[model samples]
Each structure stands twice: as C-alpha cells, then as structure tokens.
Target: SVQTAATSWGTVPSIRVYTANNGKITERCWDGKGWYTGAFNEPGDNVSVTSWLVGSAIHIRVYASTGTTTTEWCWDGNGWTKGAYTSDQTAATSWGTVPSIRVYTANNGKITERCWDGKGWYTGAFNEPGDNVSVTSWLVGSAIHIRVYASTGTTTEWCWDGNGWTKGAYTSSTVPGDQTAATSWGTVPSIRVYTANNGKITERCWDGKGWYTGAFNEPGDNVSVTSWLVGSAIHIRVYASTGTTTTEWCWDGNGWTKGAYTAT
Candidate 1:
C-alpha cells in the first residue's frame, strides 16, 4: 500500500510515492513543503513498486499484472518517463554510474536481471527458479547483494560484481511464507533479511564477510516484515496475518530488541 523512496536533494530530502489502485498507476512527490502530483500511467494486477536514486533523479521499478514483465519509470528532473520493460516486481539499486534491476521471469520463475548504464537498458542474466518468489537487494561498495524467498520454502542470497551473479553463503531450507524484506546500514556495510518463519521472526544477516541466522519475536504465523535503517540500527515492523498490533523489532549492531507496537 505504501511504496516510497527518499534522498537528500537540496536542503531537504525528496520523497516519491507510487501507488496502484484497481489497475491504474499514479505517482506523487514530496519536496520539503508538501506532496505534488507526478504521473498517472497504465495499469495491471499484482502491482508492487520500489524506488531508488541515481545522481539527481529518482528511478522506480513496478511489477504490474500476471505476466513476468515489469516496467521501469524514471524522474529525471523534468518529468516521469516510462522507460523500460524487462522482466515481476523485485529490487533496484546501483554500484557505479549505472543502475541495476532484478526480477523473476514468468515463463520459468527464474531470477532475472537488467541494468541501466546512463544510456539505455542492458539485458542481464537469469538465475535459479522459484515459485511465488520475493526479492530484496542492497549495495556493498561495488558489489550488489540480494535476498530471495519463495513459496517453495527456500531462502537464498545472490550477488553480482560487474562480472556475474554468484550465490551467497546463506541459504535457508525452511520458511513459513514469502513475506520478507531487507535493509543495510553502517560504514562496515551490513545487510539483514527478515522473514516470517512459522510463528516467529527469523533473521539472516551478512556482516561483510559471512552470514549468520538469528530469531526474533514470535508474533504469529504468516507474519509480514518490512524494515528501514535508522542511524546505526535496523528497525523491522512485524505484523501477523490477523492481529491487533504490529510488533516492532530493532537490531542495534549487537542483537535484536523488541520495541513498541502499533495498532494493526
């Protein structure tokens, strides 16, 4: 429901809100003072949007409809232009001058990727096959890392280094459902993935060197996790399938500690 991205533009951070209703897609922006309109584009089903920044512009990746194709929309200081169509809704990030996008092709449900190197969209590669797959990714120096979860109860990580995509060290064999998210923080650049596992929260983290697994609050079954970085800490909000409050968990470099809850 809430898909947004923010980064420092001038004196304040610029935030972009992209939403889909029924089938139509709409866009809005926040420039310190207030929210403003952007674009109202074409539509589809199973809409998911994620955004990131490249230079002074904002890049948006949207997965719409039942097909394997996803769309790339960009805000290049002028207007929101419908850019590329490659392959579901996944994650988008950058390493150098170019930006990268990842998704799973509908034909085989395999992980696929594409990149934008300032000029145009360059087709990338396809990885492992999955069902009802979910992806979240981040950047570490010049390398790109991704966390993937699927309905088949497999959780795996992948990375690319201007060469090829290589599977990471951590891969889980059991997870309750596909609801999962990831975030990165700090100078050492650590990455964490949170997912629903049976009746509790499970965490798999990359500490620049290797990966480690940890367990958090046991909210309930089929919970959904979404997170953000707050200073040096990572804050994850966990909401159960049916609940009164959404429990919060904070990871402050050391361990995970429970925070307050908001009404579900």
Candidate 2:
C-alpha cells in the first residue's frame, strides 16, 4: 500500500504523515486520532514528500524523482488546495503552517523565500539569503539558511517565530550546507530553542515571568530543538560538525543551565 510509504511526526498525538508513490505524493493527518488523506499528483515518476502542519492541518510540497518539477497541496483544515512551487529549490521547510521556500535563478542566489499569505505566496529570499544560494543550501524548520561566497561561502541560518527572529552563524569550515531544527514546547512554546550558527546553543523561555538566555557550545557545529517538558523545559542538543560529539541544553521552566545531556 502506498499508505505504507511514509514519514511521521508526533508531539503528544499531534501527528502528520507524508507518503509518495509513482509520482504521486499523499499526506494524511491524525488529529483527534482519525485520519484524513489527500494526494499531490504531478507529471513524473517516483515523487517525493516533504510536509508540515498548518495549525494542525497538513500541508505538502513534492518534487519528481529529479528533485525539480515540484508542486504543492495543502489541507488548511476546512479543505485542500493545490498550487505551484517557486524556484527550483535551494532549500525548503515548513514555517509553522505555511512554507519558507528558498529558491535561486540568476541573481546573487540571494536565496530569497516566497511564503503563503491570503490568496497566494510571497516573493523570493527575504533579501533573505540576501547572501545567495550557491547550488547548496540548508534550513531549520524555524530558521532560513543562507550561503555567501564573498566571505568564503559563509553560511548563516535565520528563523522567526511569533516572538521574533534569531540567527545562528556557521563557521566557514563546517561544510557549505547542512540542516537545522526549530522547536516550540509548553502550553504555547513557553520553551523555545535555536542554534548560533557558530554552533553555539541558545535557549529562550517565558518562565511565567519574562525572557532569559543561556549558553551551551563549541563554536563549529549544528543544533536542534524539541520539547521534553521536564517541568516545562525547552530542550536542545548540539552536534559538533565533526559528528564526533553531541551536547545537550535545556530550560526546565525555571532557569537555564548546561544541564546533563539526556537521551530523549
């Protein structure tokens, strides 16, 4: 069953599924534990699926076996809608509900982004990669990644949540491109985390009072964020670009600390 060909995401039963078969991509949602499915059909073979949820609804973007010729389909809760993809794709990921699709043409690869608004989507790069996309690019679900040749192909990742946007700078030595993560936890993301580009681990929180920052790093690595709750903590982990070590950081709704690296 093509239904078996899929990837899943879950955070306390809030799950999303993406499946692909014969140039056809399908996405299904399990919100109240019931499933709702839809397919994004394209004119090619062996299609691929990459999707995210929009306020509990599933949204998807798919490309053919070639990686281009991508199309989109989204379930905005009420119904499903189909559209087109921008740029050939330097990198792409779900921006919460809508998508932050990075693309390139001839320009500086300024690797801008086109986002979904009311009726359609936005334009390229926020000035975004304003730096440029040179064939290779990466992104964190919450951040946008940019590569600049002037600074010896310097790469940077940027992301913005309802709170604001934060950036993590990547060392010039850690390969040109890679991946990143953005997570929100708590009743409403009371615990949030992001990377510092230089592999610096930073976590922010709304401790029932105000905001605070913490450090957990090495300067040349990558990071990811998700929830562990731990009494309301926003958990984070960092991987040295060398892939030799992994560091963990957390905010237990109280304060910040180097906290023991727990495997969750």
Candidate 3:
C-alpha cells in the first residue's frame, strides 16, 4: 500500500510518500530539490506516513507481518524513536499544532480509534455494525474526515468537529471498494474521496451544498488506488494486480488526463 503526507518546509510545500517495497518501508521526499531518499530498509509489509510541524518531526506507521501488529516510529529532527503500538491496520492523522493524533483501527467487525493528546494515548468510542472492509482518513483543516467501507457494501462518512464525532451513511450507490483517497481543492473547497466503485474509480464529493458523485477515466479491476493533491490538481496512481506498474491519472480541476505508466 502507498501512504503520503504533505507539510511545509519553511515556505515551500513538501510531499513525502511511504510504501512497502519488497516488504521494506521506503520513503521518497520532494521539497524543492528534486527527489531524494528520506529513509528506507525498515521492515514492514504496509506503511503510512504523516508529518507534525510543531515537533518538526515525521511519523511512520507500519503493519508488521510477523506479529500482525501496527507500530509507529517518529523522527523528531534529531533522532528516531519507536512511539507506540496498536493492533490491526491503523490510519493516523492529526489536526492543528497541538499534536493531537488520531489512529483509526479495524477490530473484528467495527472501527475503533485511538487518540494522542500531546501527552498520553487514549481510546475513543466509534464502532459500526458491519464488518470493516477498508478504511482511509485524513484531516481537512480542523475536521477529521474518515471514509469507511463496510462488508455490507455501505460506506460511512465520519467527521470530528473538534468536540464530538458526527457521522452519516453514504447514499446507496456510493459503495466504495477497499481502496480510497480523500482530498480537497478550490477557494471554497469541497471534500472528495476517490475510491474503487464497482471496479471503476469514482469520486464522492461534498461541496457543503450536498453530495455529488462522478467517475474518472474507464474501469479497472486493479489491486489498489492512492492519490495526493498538488497545487490545484489531484494526482492518482492505480496499481495493476499483475505487476508493480501503475497508471497515473490527474485531475486538473476540469477533467481527468492519463499519464505514463511507471513501474516501482
């Protein structure tokens, strides 16, 4: 799987991507100066990366195949320290500069979340009825945005309004598959999550007015989909099931355009 985190280095925006290459976690960073290796050789099957500006640090979360447990490691500008551990494939994100971290985990047939309030870790009450098929989350400004795909072919939009958790079920035709990516653009931004819908890449967008749906390019029964936002465009990488070659797609605020196929 591919996980990315975006932050600013002084004044320039920086984007870092982490993925499991041959069962090892590797980091590719771009911050004005071409592409460079941030870190690599870590042992993990799945990886997720996020950055905290207050601590001037970057956090890497990994799911180890040996123990089937999720662990987090942080680089606090000076040295690396293994932070914490949790069960299952967890998604991590934070809001504001207070260092409050939210990690959503899959448990049996529910979605459980853990939080870090700049001090200690604690648990939160958030569980649904159906079995957890896939989960992806990120912070849109100050709100925690989560899209959970259930085994019942239903998706749930979970939001944290700085105080409490408020959620609503997506419409019937919005059943996203196991892969998803959430992003926003424009001056008056709209929340959008690109997911595999019935073997096609569909965009489920919320523009404050209401929810709308759209499709990108043709259908592909691919293995995974991941995306990131740069400038005013949305970039996506679709991984083919047979090999590591990925088809790149970009949305330039108007329509989708296909790019080259690159193998990683």
Candidate 4:
C-alpha cells in the first residue's frame, strides 16, 4: 500500500524498491559528492523511505515487510545508529529536554519512550496506535508550534508556552498600501489603489513610527491581504484587474471571508 509522506517545511517524496530473490535490499542517498549506500536491510514486501529534521539531528524511517516492521534511525551530524529494529517505530525531537533523545516503540505499536527534560529522561504521554500520529515541532518567536496531522487530512496545531499547550490556528495576512510615516498615518495602514487596466498596486505597513513601502509598482496579482493580529484593522490586497473593477479581499485572522472596496 502506498502511503503519503509529509514534512513540516517542504514536500517529501517517497521511493519504493522491489525486493529480489537475493534477500538483500540496497539503498543509496545523494550527499552532494556521489550516490552513497545509506543502509542495507533484508528483503521485504514493500519498502519506503522518508526523512525529517528534528532539532540538530535528522530522523529517518524505513518501512519494510507488510508495512508492519519498521527500522528507525537518527543522524546527529555524526553517524547513523546501528539498525535498531522496532515495530511501527517513530521518533520526535526538540522536546526541550537535555541529553536530548527521541521517543519510539519496539513492540510494533504506539510510541513508548522517555523524553529528555534538560536533566534526565521523563516519561510522557502514551499515544494510541492509529494513523496520522507523527509529531513535528516549529518555532515562532518565543513560542513552539507542535502540529499533528490526522489520517483524515485534518490538521491540529498546538502552541507550547514552555508550560502547557494552547490550541490555535496559524494566522497570516497581507495588507496593500503605502505607509510613509507611522505617526503621520495615525498608526493605521492603508493601500493605494490604481484603477488602470494593468497598473502597479503598492502596500505599506505602519510600525507606530513611519511607513516603509516594501515594493512599489507591484502587479495586483503579486499581493496578499490579511490581518494577522487580533484587532479591528482590516488588511487588503489587490489582485488582477477586471476592466473597471479591481479584485481585493480582507481577512482579520479569524476567517477567510473576503470583502471588496472600491478605491478610485
């Protein structure tokens, strides 16, 4: 069975190799020098490979033989771990623990391991065996974002504040306008609209001081509009023009419902 492999930053593509009668499976990876043999394992029914970055180390999972038996390995800028065989094994890093170590399973079920706590390994939560149980961490400012993707294509993102987890949606938005000065603009960001058939639409932000126009003469198609913070400020971006009417939309981090405003 072909399963989808996902990564936190970029797209991850899977490679499948058919086993031969020789009972040996060979693999190689491009290390900017040449194709080097990564690791070798016994012949299995179906073999898949995926890799992800965890803190300073890279975690790799190799699924073989009926998608039940899995071998988990980690590379900490030094070398690969000796084939640690486990059933349905998974690993996660950046647990804010010292003597950092990833969690995994050996009995072919859900994850069971001691996590690092800057001093020693601490027993965490026991995850139930199911689909879409992979864990990954993301850092934004002073917060940590832990995202869990379900097998049903639904994703849940949680924020860790070094104490507990806070559930929230990933908020992002773009506002189009020219902000010359923050004080002169009254701390309010605005957009400059051009009604030409194909003219440039510029946007600027007010940082409570001055307006610094990022890029001028930008095509409407190259703009995004949304308010990332919680406030009454409306963010707007201009898209391609349709004759007399130029398409624009606004979002305030709560919803993606768009509204139009004409600026001639």
Candidate 5:
C-alpha cells in the first residue's frame, strides 16, 4: 500500500504528504489546528509537505517541474535545509507614452517636475532657481499645470495639477533671493533661508559676492542650505541646536573647515 498512502494517517495528525499517480493531490501541516495546504508542483513531481508558520518557524515552497528549479525551505526551530533560489527577470524597456510633463535637472541647478496620468506617475513641484527654463501649459483638464521661463532677467512661475502648489507671478528685476544655475560642475551662486530677529536660524550661501555662513548655533534655529554636485560640497543643516559649544563649519571642496561638535 506504499506505506498506506505514504504513512500520515490523519484524523488531524498528518504533518505532510502529497501524492499523485495522476490523482494530483497536495497536503501541508502542523495539524494541531492551523495550516493545511495543497496545489502547486507539476512536472515529474515529488512532494513532501508540512510547513507554514509565521511566528514559530516553518515555511516551504519547492517547485521544479522538469528542471527550471525553484526551492525555498525554512524551519529554524530545528530542522529543514536548503533555502534560497531566485531567477525572474524582465525589463528592457516597454512602458511608454505618458508625458504631460516630466523634467529633472539637478546638479545644484535644481528643477524637478513630474506628471503623467493616463495610468501613472505624478509628483510635480520643485523649481529652485531653474536658470535655463521652459515649461509651459501642460494639458488635460488644465487650470494651469506649470509655466516657468527665466533665462536671464525675470521670470518665475509655478503651478501643479493634482491639488497643490500654486504660486505664480514674478516679472523681472530678479529679486527672488536664491537664484542659482551654472554648472559644468561648478556654479550655485546662492541659497538662503534665514529667520533671525532673535529667533536665530540662518543658512546662507553665495560664494560669489557675499554670504557663506552655515551652522550657527540656535536662537530660534531653522537652517537648511544645500549646494552640492556642481559646486561639489556646501551642505549645512542646523535645524535645531542649542546644547552649546559653538564652532561647526564645513565646506570641504577646497575651503572652509572647523567642524566637530555634538550637544543637542
């Protein structure tokens, strides 16, 4: 009787057994009252089942149907060996056409905008002194998707479609405060975010004419200056600091350095 159907008598005590002379049946266990399985394994078959537990340990999936091979078994509580085998690859390029707008240019020239939904991809808004620009109108129910054009004098505009970011109107005399763009790998003229009236939180960077101060201990504290990858290094963060030891500055591209302090 082939050990009476592979010896796992059952009544509620069959750990694992899967048989198929052409009957094609499956089984899995821990029959105290949880985890009973079947169906999967189909080529020159060989099934020996009994494994499924998320917390105590026991998990198995073995499929090789004529040798393309795939097996993963784990029972870390005590026994069961041979685990890990993965081979599934596909992607050469073929997910096309969905561009209402998508532009990304950052080397400290920062300009990020993404949008396209006939099926996917949407996240638009981030134009930090996009010095050489041309983004306009973006359709599909349009109420103003985006329009930014500033090459020299004055032109700054921003808008979004999916319920956010709508701040437009900037004509010409520049005066935007942080306008950076000129990179072969070197040029991020300015980046400032200050709030000091006694609330102290400053982050200034311009290395062309004036400011280059970063990480100046707190009074009100809230700094964030970044200019990396074209100017090669100028990242300063003093979001919150007031433990007291003052003396932290770093620009390491070929200049400033005296950084080392830890308090808050």
Candidate 6:
C-alpha cells in the first residue's frame, strides 16, 4: 500500500476518445513525445470508452459498434489490442493505489471492476445493477473505491482492500449525482457528493452514519467540488448561485463557513 493522503483524478493521466457522425475513431495520448493521436471507426454506429494508467504503463478500452454488437480494442502501454468490453468502466483515477475500472455486464445485469493494483490487474466479481450508465473510482491507502449510480438514482459503493472487494451502500437519501466518488484521510470511507435539486446545491457528507448537509441561502445546484488533503485535514469549497446572488463556502477541517470571493 502506498502511503498517500487521498485518491483523485488529479493523480493519474487520461485521454478522452470519440467518434464523429461520419464513423471515424480518434484515440489521443500524452507522453514525453508530447500530445498525439490514434484512431479507428470500423464499426459504424456509436462507441464505448474506458482507460487507466499504472506507473508508466497505461491501459485503454474502446468499442466501436455495428448495430447491436461491438468490436472492442484495448491498449496496454506497448500497443492497442482488440476485444469485447463495456463503456461504463471508470478509468485513470487514484491517490495511492493504481488506476482501476468498474465494468458493467450485459447491459447492466452484473458488474466486475478491474485495475492495475501496483502488482498486476486485479479484477473483482460482479455486483450488481440495472440500466445505468456511470461508474467511478478512487483510493484509500491501497484500497480501491468504486461507485455506481442507478438509472433509478440510488448509489452503490464498493472497495478493494488489496485482497477481495467488499460492497457497501449509502445510508443517506441523497440522489446520486453524475459525478460522485468517495475519499479518505484515514482508513474509514466517506463519500464526496455534489447534488443539485431544482438548482439548489447542498454540500453534504454521506455514508453509514447518515448525511451531514451544510446550510446556505437560496441557491442553485450548478456547483462543483475539487479536493485535496493537507496532511490530515480534509478541505472542501463550494460555489453556488441564485441568479443575482453568488456565494462560496469553505471547509478547513471544521464545519463550513460561507465567504464571498472579493478582488477588492
């Protein structure tokens, strides 16, 4: 286990691939060679995407479709290879553990998460869900965190403690956001959730203990959270708007305090 304070998307490298309406594939990457491109579009419909980095070796998954089927390819640092795979896999996210992916099976029946666990590719058994679209990852020490948001809007969480994967659930009533993942300063699990209901953003800590929601004024949920741990302190800041009024909230280890950003 690497002794790092947090798991974040900031810790790894990634490339976003896409297909044009005309059926062409483009895969992009970054290296000492600087930024560059690689592409395909043989299967002509839509595409599926996923990737991760482990040390100097990076992995990627892409599936170009032809009607109901797909021709999937994988890139393993050295080069890209062909296969069949899922698009919902979470890629290139970590703080200490190697980057990993949580994959859905057969249109959301079962799930299997795999990652470069500093040693080799560690794949976990299927868990669980239905017609849903996103899966994400993070880290706590060497433990890998996995998150799933159902099409119905509930959240399912999982972790890999360098052994096998263990699953857990969110005890709070908060609806899962498009971007949600867990973090840790210690060994315990606490999820970072940014949820907006009717344009009102609520900064909340969610888990087995229940949800701890912060206070604010008439607000809009159009918000974001970027985080890092300072030694043992967990800090988070939030910015929101109610059309005319905009406020920023900060947490410097204790509870939250709202303060307006002033250039004057």
lDDT of 5 at 50: 23
Candidates 1 and 2, the one with greater lDDT: 1
Stretches of candidate 1 above 4 Å error?
1-42, 47-50, 54-59, 77-79, 103-108, 132-153, 171-173, 197-201, 214-264
Off by over 4 Å in 5: 1-112, 115-165, 168-264
Most accurate candidate by lDDT: 3
**Candidate 1 deviation (Cα RMSD):** 5.5
lDDT of 4 by residue, 69-173 (tens): 544433444555544443332434353323244343322433344354445556655443322233434344455444321121122223344466565342212
Candidate 3, residues 188-262, lDDT tens digits: the string is: 445565555455656666666777775554453333444455665555443332234334454545677663433
User: Would you list the clashing residue pairs of candidate 3?
Assistant: none
Provide backbone clash counts, one per model: 1, 16, 0, 12, 2, 4
| lDDT head-to-head 1 vs 5, winner | 1
Residue 43 accuracy (lDDT) in model 3 = 73
Q: Candidate 5, which ten residues in sequence have the lowest lDDT sum?
A: 87-96
Estimated TM-score per prediction? 0.62, 0.40, 0.72, 0.36, 0.19, 0.45
lDDT of 2 by residue, 166-225 (tens): 553333323343323334433333333333344443343333355455343444344433
lDDT of 1 by residue, 1-264 (tens): 322222222224444434444456555455646656656466653444455556766555555544555655555545656666654445444434355545443334554555566566666665565544455565557565555444443666555444666775666545533545455555465666665555565667777787777555455443334455545455444333323233444444466666333323
Question: Which ranking of candidates, highest lDDT first?
Answer: 3, 1, 6, 2, 4, 5
Flag the better candidate by lDDT, 2 or 4.
Answer: 2
lDDT by residue for model 5 (1-264), tens: 000011121233333333322323233333436544533334323222222234533343332212323233333455545543232100000112222323333223454443333355455455454433333232344343443433332445454554776655433333332221111112223333332222344443334365445444344321212222323343332222232222233454554454332222
lDDT of 3 at 195: 56
Model 5 lDDT, full chain set: 0.32
Off by over 4 Å in 2: 1-11, 17-68, 77-80, 84-87, 90-110, 128-154, 159-173, 184-264
For candidate 2, report its TM-score: 0.40
Scanning candidate 6 in windows of ten residues, the lowest lDDT window is: 1-10
lDDT for 53 (candidate 6): 54
Regions of candidate 4 where Cα sits further than 4 Å from its true position = 1-27, 40-79, 83-91, 95-114, 118-121, 126-130, 140-143, 170-264
Residue 24 error, candidate 2, Å: 6.0
